[PDB]
């Protein structure tokens, strides 16, 4: 009777608490993960923009057009973070705004 | 605020292309800052040929 029927209560109490409380913290997670991961993308992104002072232009899908003939070792070095933007500068201006 | 008067240095930095002097230092503080009245200047600097 009564007693079997407060603990059948503590018990549903327990698990329903216990599953929507679950239930947000893997939502709040999942959202977490999705935002850090594409943060560090935008981190990544900015890191290359930043990097090249005026050298690149926003092509308008996460793309950059570089005004010189960037070869490997130049490709190589935009992604090692070591780029001088100065040696190119003049030239990618120059190409940049033609006359 | 600052249109055509500050590049990205790289590292959460600006370079101004004018002497700025303390009042154009404490406007940009102040955000008063115009960049017409520097900006011609500021531009053939920038884009110096």
Same mark, same amino acid.
Request: hydrophobic letters at 30%; glycine letters at 6%.
């Given at each position: 009777?009564?007693? +079997? @029927?407060?603990?059948?209560?503590?018990?549903?109490?327990?698990?329903?608490?216990?599953?929507?409380?679950?239930?947000?913290? =893997?939502?709040?997670?999942? +959202?977490?993960?999705? *935002?850090?991961? *594409?943060?560090?993308?935008?981190?990544?992104?900015?890191?290359?923009?930043? +990097?090249?002072?005026?050298?690149?232009? @926003?092509?308008?899908?996460?793309?950059?057009?570089?005004?010189?003939?960037? *070869?490997?070792?130049?490709?190589?070095?935009?992604?090692?973070?070591?780029? *001088?933007? @100065? =040696?190119?500068? @003049?030239?990618?201006?120059?190409?940049?705004?033609?006359?």
């Amino acid at each position: 009777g009564r007693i +079997q @029927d407060l603990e059948k209560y503590v018990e549903d109490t327990k698990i329903d608490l216990w599953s929507y409380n679950a239930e947000l913290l =893997v939502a709040l997670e999942n +959202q977490h993960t999705i *935002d850090l991961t *594409d943060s560090e993308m935008n981190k990544l992104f900015e890191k290359t923009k930043k +990097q090249l002072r005026e050298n690149a232009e @926003d092509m308008g899908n996460g793309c950059f057009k570089i005004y010189h003939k960037c *070869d490997n070792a130049c490709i190589g070095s935009i992604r090692n973070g070591t780029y *001088d933007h @100065d =040696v190119y500068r @003049d030239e990618a201006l120059n190409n940049r705004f033609q006359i």
